[PDB]
């Protein structure tokens, strides 16, 4: 004979009060199973008595990490103090129904007047909490703010991540998406620089013949203004652009003096210098990505970084998909991702598999094993020269 | 939906009151046909599948206005035999199946508590309040309503019961803690005006337990002081205020709230020659606070808000008023 029952869910814990309790001899009967199916014949059994939601996801996380371990929380003790009639079991008891046996023992030890029935032992309270878990969306919907699906989703993620310690040694997404960004904007830098090179050599065609390194081309067409306004070493720029006094600026200016290209307009020069500012901003962002990605690679997988070099190492990581996939692959699959060249390739694949599994399966990895394997590859590079 | 067969009982229950009203000369027969049709439409709306707390409240308001109309008409036609007990019983029935259907609606719970308090039902009010607190334990408004009505009744032990369970539950926001300190010091003022309690150590204990709560900010302690600073006409009020100031000074040394309580401390029970004396003391504290190393924009916004509170009162001198304006404008 049950009086109340606890029921804990991801939004909070609610205790129901049973009226017209379930038949215990005909629990395996088809009419009683159909009654437990239909909400119109199970809501006559249960009536919602109290509800306690969590204050925050931190409290829900503490709630699971206490309840699954077995120990009851202080706010569950609080809500039971509030909802149950205060007795001690000398002349009248209260039967509570709980899902877990350790929680049953602890609630009975905290409240001596409450006899708890566990769902793991008693079939009546098992079927009754089973029906409440069946209809739990509709029994709470008058005070169910939102849904239960996203709450269970986020709470299962928080519980699993707290059990696993996931975020402290899962770090590879920054590396693989940084490789994707680096290649995409390297292509975009080269394409925008080719476009500004053609569309400014239409105006001043000596700059393509006399100046390479298209980033420095974008800088000199940012600083040069028009064809008419040239002077060599005016202020702050060309001395640290390139050689200053006797080598380059004179040649650019005599190229402007003998220059024959089409005269450009002010608004067209404005648009070309806007495109050059765009290209050099993307180049500055490329060097910021390269520095930050070298630092992140030295934080995540330093052995692969020292045996391969960080661009090709992080390319290999991104093509494998993750460090866990890279470590699970053997050395021949890492070959997939004359004779001496293939021999050194196989040896490098073996040592790169060893470096990948060492750098992955550490908590916070090291440097010296990659240093040892790079010394081993260097002494093999010395070894193949004797023959 | 068996709603016709379900509402048949409530109409057959409301029928003999209509028979009494027809056999008296109070409602005529066409008006009683209108009452029958309106109660029938209301019952078939109430017992419908897809219903709403506003629908339950519309039915409650109609039945209560019918009771008021019949009271006016009965006093006008000079009858004393007709009683309001059947109407109050059916209004309690509407409210009970209302809180059965929608227990998660505090508007309907508070309307139920307002109705049960208005027709003089104290024990029923306490039972409804217990059920509402069990369903909405995180609601500071319900907890303060329970505690304040138990203090208004005078059962201070029951008021403390409701308030201590409320402070056990509602620990995210300071609101119920401030209201509990307000109710305990109002009990202290009642114990003074009736002339332990001689020490008045309970708001100091409330502060000492509130020091470790998840809302414990300097703004929250300033809210504690802004609660405490009212009704200064007591005995241990200087003890409580001084303990709050030394707690805030030992914990948050250079906060603008702590400098604000350093400004506004010595004006506890002043209204009168002791008023501008303590004002000159507080303005010395304020000038030292303005020159001192604190976030001056935050402290100045606090002081211009308190100075709007100052400017809200009449009966002062114009030189003091214009020097408040002069010190206000350059902030």
């Amino acid at each position: 004979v049950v009086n109340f029952l606890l029921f804990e869910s991801a939004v909070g814990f609610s205790l129901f009060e049973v009226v017209h309790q379930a038949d215990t001899v005909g629990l395996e009967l088809p009419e009683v199973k159909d009654a437990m199916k239909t909400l119109d014949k199970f809501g006559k059994m249960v009536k919602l008595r109290s509800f306690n939601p969590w204050t925050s996801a931190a409290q829900g996380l503490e709630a699971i990490n206490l309840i699954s371990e077995g120990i009851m929380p202080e706010y569950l003790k609080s809500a039971l103090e509030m909802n149950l009639p205060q007795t001690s079991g000398k002349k009248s008891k209260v039967v509570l129904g709980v899902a877990d046996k350790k929680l049953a023992g602890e609630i009975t030890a905290a409240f001596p007047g409450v006899q708890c029935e566990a769902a793991d032992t008693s079939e009546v309270v098992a079927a009754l909490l089973r029906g409440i878990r069946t209809h739990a969306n509709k029994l709470h919907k008058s005070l169910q703010e939102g849904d239960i699906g996203r709450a269970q989703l986020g709470l299962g993620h928080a519980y699993s991540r707290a059990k696993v310690k996931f975020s402290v040694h899962k770090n590879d997404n920054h590396i693989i998406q940084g490789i994707a960004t680096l290649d995409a904007l390297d292509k975009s830098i080269n394409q925008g620089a080719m476009r500004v090179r053609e569309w400014y050599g239409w105006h001043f065609p000596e700059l393509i013949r006399i100046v390479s390194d298209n980033i420095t081309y974008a800088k000199v067409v940012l600083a040069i203004g028009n064809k008419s306004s040239l002077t060599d070493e005016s202020v702050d720029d060309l001395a640290n652009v390139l050689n200053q006094d006797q080598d380059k600026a004179l040649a650019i200016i005599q190229a402007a003096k003998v220059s024959m290209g089409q005269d450009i307009s002010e608004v067209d020069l404005q648009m070309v210098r806007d495109l050059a500012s765009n290209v050099t901003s993307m180049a500055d962002y490329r060097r910021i990505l390269a520095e930050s990605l070298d630092k992140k690679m030295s934080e995540v997988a330093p052995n692969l970084q020292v045996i391969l070099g960080t661009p090709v190492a992080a390319r290999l990581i991104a093509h494998a998909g993750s460090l866990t996939n890279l470590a699970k692959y053997p050395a021949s699959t890492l070959q997939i991702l004359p004779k001496v060249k293939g021999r050194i390739s196989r040896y490098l694949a073996n040592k790169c598999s060893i470096a990948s599994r060492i750098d992955n399966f550490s908590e916070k990895p090291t440097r010296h094993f990659g240093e040892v394997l790079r010394q081993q590859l260097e002494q093999r590079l010395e070894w193949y020269a004797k023959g | 939906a068996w709603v016709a067969d379900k509402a048949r009982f409530y109409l057959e229950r409301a029928a003999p009151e209509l028979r009494e009203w027809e056999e008296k000369e109070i409602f005529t027969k066409d008006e009683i046909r209108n009452l029958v049709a309106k109660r029938s439409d209301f019952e078939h709306l109430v017992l419908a599948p897809g219903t709403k707390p506003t629908d339950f409240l519309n039915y409650v308001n109609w039945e209560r206005s019918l009771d008021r109309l019949r009271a006016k008409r009965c006093a006008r036609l000079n009858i004393r035999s007709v009683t309001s007990h059947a109407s109050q019983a059916r209004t309690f029935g509407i409210f009970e199946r209302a809180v059965l259907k929608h227990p998660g609606s505090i508007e309907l719970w508070l309307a139920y508590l307002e109705f049960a308090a208005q027709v003089k039902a104290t024990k029923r009010w306490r039972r409804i309040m217990t059920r509402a607190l069990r369903l909405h334990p995180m609601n500071a408004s319900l907890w303060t309503l329970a505690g304040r009505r138990a203090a208004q009744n005078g059962d201070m032990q029951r008021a403390r019961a409701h308030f201590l369970r409320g402070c056990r539950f509602c620990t995210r926001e300071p609101t119920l803690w401030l209201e509990y300190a307000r109710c305990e010091m109002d009990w202290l003022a009642r114990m003074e005006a009736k002339k332990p309690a001689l020490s008045g150590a309970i708001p100091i204990a409330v502060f000492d337990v509130a020091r470790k709560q998840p809302f414990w900010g300097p703004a929250a302690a300033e809210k504690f002081f802004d609660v405490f600073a009212k009704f200064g006409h007591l005995s241990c009020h200087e003890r409580i205020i001084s303990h709050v100031v030394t707690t805030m000074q030992e914990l948050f040394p250079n906060h603008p709230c702590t400098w604000s309580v350093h400004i506004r401390q010595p004006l506890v029970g002043v209204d009168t020659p002791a008023f501008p004396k303590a004002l000159r003391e507080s303005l010395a504290r304020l000038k030292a606070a303005l020159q001192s190393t604190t976030d001056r924009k935050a402290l100045a916004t606090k002081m211009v808000a308190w100075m709007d509170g100052i400017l809200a009162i009449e009966k002062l001198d114009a030189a003091i008023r214009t020097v408040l304006e002069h010190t206000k404008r350059s902030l």
Partner: peptide, 28 residues
């Protein structure tokens, strides 16, 4: 009877607040 919320005692006192308030009212 679980009709109303009974006044707390030292048996049904949970937190440090209720312990300290009951200690003060016991010393009263």
């Amino acid at each position: 009877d679980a009709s109303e919320l009974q006044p707390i005692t030292q048996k049904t006192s949970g937190t440090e607040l209720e312990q300290t308030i009951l200690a003060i009212m016991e010393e009263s």
